[PDB]
Design an enzyme around this catalytic site. Structure first.
Site, PDB file in Angstrom:
ATOM      1  N   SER A  46       0.556  -1.145   0.363  1.00  0.00           N
ATOM      2  CA  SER A  46       0.007  -0.086  -0.005  1.00  0.00           C
ATOM      3  C   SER A  46       0.610   1.419  -0.106  1.00  0.00           C
ATOM      4  O   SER A  46       0.164   2.107  -0.290  1.00  0.00           O
ATOM      5  CB  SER A  46      -1.064  -0.222   1.127  1.00  0.00           C
ATOM      6  OG  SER A  46      -1.718  -0.711   0.657  1.00  0.00           O
ATOM      7  N   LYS A 184       2.479   6.594   4.592  1.00  0.00           N
ATOM      8  CA  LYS A 184       1.991   5.703   4.148  1.00  0.00           C
ATOM      9  C   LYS A 184       2.444   4.547   4.814  1.00  0.00           C
ATOM     10  O   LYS A 184       3.874   4.143   4.183  1.00  0.00           O
ATOM     11  CB  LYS A 184       1.676   5.965   3.064  1.00  0.00           C
ATOM     12  CG  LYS A 184       1.254   4.465   2.699  1.00  0.00           C
ATOM     13  CD  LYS A 184      -0.553   5.116   2.373  1.00  0.00           C
ATOM     14  CE  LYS A 184      -1.707   4.000   2.141  1.00  0.00           C
ATOM     15  NZ  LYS A 184      -1.216   2.383   3.548  1.00  0.00           N
ATOM     16  N   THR A 185       1.664   3.173   5.321  1.00  0.00           N
ATOM     17  CA  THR A 185       2.229   1.742   5.182  1.00  0.00           C
ATOM     18  C   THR A 185       1.640   1.118   3.955  1.00  0.00           C
ATOM     19  O   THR A 185       1.246   1.745   3.276  1.00  0.00           O
ATOM     20  CB  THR A 185       1.419   2.085   6.961  1.00  0.00           C
ATOM     21  OG1 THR A 185      -0.414   1.754   6.755  1.00  0.00           O
ATOM     22  CG2 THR A 185       1.505   2.830   7.793  1.00  0.00           C
ATOM     23  N   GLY A 186       2.550  -0.175   3.879  1.00  0.00           N
ATOM     24  CA  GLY A 186       2.262  -1.317   3.964  1.00  0.00           C
ATOM     25  C   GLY A 186       2.457  -2.270   3.873  1.00  0.00           C
ATOM     26  O   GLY A 186       3.781  -1.737   4.894  1.00  0.00           O
TER      27      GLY A 186
END
Length: 237
Positions: A46, A184-186
């Site tokens: 993501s 932003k995480t992923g």
């Protein structure tokens, strides 16, 4: 102010396989923990929502951060996904289905053109227009993610400036009295064995770009990042 060349983050990576990159914007210095992993191209998960949102706004696949796509009613794995979403809320909650719908509207030709124009990793979307960032064909290194986020911060990308302002605002994680944390995480949701947190932090007169990439969840990557930023007095309140 912190001297990033003297950072030490060893305590936050005990029993973990990860990398941390911190770039001091004003002093133009970069700290790297685990340079070998920092150079390894990996699937972005993501974190791809950042370039995806820029492209989708730029080509008018979506109108703004509030563009509503109605939930289809299918119950998916995470409760937060099972409701109507916007471009901005789907970034905040990593709502894959929203960004898959947008990617299909962007289409393969425009997506390929834009990823080439911004030189995003291996630029490989052959895994499928709505799949290529999800443990699939597209790969980008932590250092390349840092460069991309730094270009977004400095607005050295070929997007309209208001679009870059909008996407950066969509990345706000914490707005304190003395700092603003953007990120932003992923996560690779099969094994939770690949995790990212990419972004930047602003304080009065200082800003820093960061990338954390680790053999754990995106939440773990974020918590490692905030622990480091708190240690060095960048996250206060």
């Amino acid at each position: 102010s912190v001297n990033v060349s003297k950072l030490n983050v060893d305590e936050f990576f005990k029993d973990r396989d990860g990398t941390f990159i911190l770039h001091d914007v004003q002093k133009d210095k970069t700290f790297i923990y685990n340079e070998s992993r920092a150079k390894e191209r990996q699937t972005p998960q993501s974190t791809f929502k950042v370039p995806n949102a820029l492209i989708g706004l730029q080509v008018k696949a979506v109108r703004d951060e509030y563009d509503v796509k109605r939930w289809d009613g299918t119950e998916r794995e995470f409760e937060s996904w099972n409701r109507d979403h916007t471009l901005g809320s789907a970034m905040r909650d990593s709502v894959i289905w929203y960004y898959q719908a947008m990617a299909r509207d962007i289409g393969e030709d425009r997506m390929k053109d834009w990823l080439h124009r911004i030189s995003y990793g291996n630029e490989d979307i052959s895994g499928g227009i709505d799949q290529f960032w999800l443990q699939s064909s597209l790969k980008i290194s932590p250092l390349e993610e840092k460069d991309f986020i730094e270009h977004l911060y400095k607005e050295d990308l070929p997007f309209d400036k208001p679009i870059m302002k909008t996407v950066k605002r969509m990345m706000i994680q914490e707005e304190g009295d003395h700092y603003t944390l953007y990120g932003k995480t992923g996560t690779r949701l099969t094994d939770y064995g690949l995790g990212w947190f990419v972004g930047f932090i602003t304080t009065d007169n200082h800003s820093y770009i960061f990338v954390t990439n680790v053999d754990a969840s995106g939440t773990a990557a974020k918590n490692i990042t905030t622990d480091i930023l708190k240690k060095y007095h960048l996250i206060t309140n």
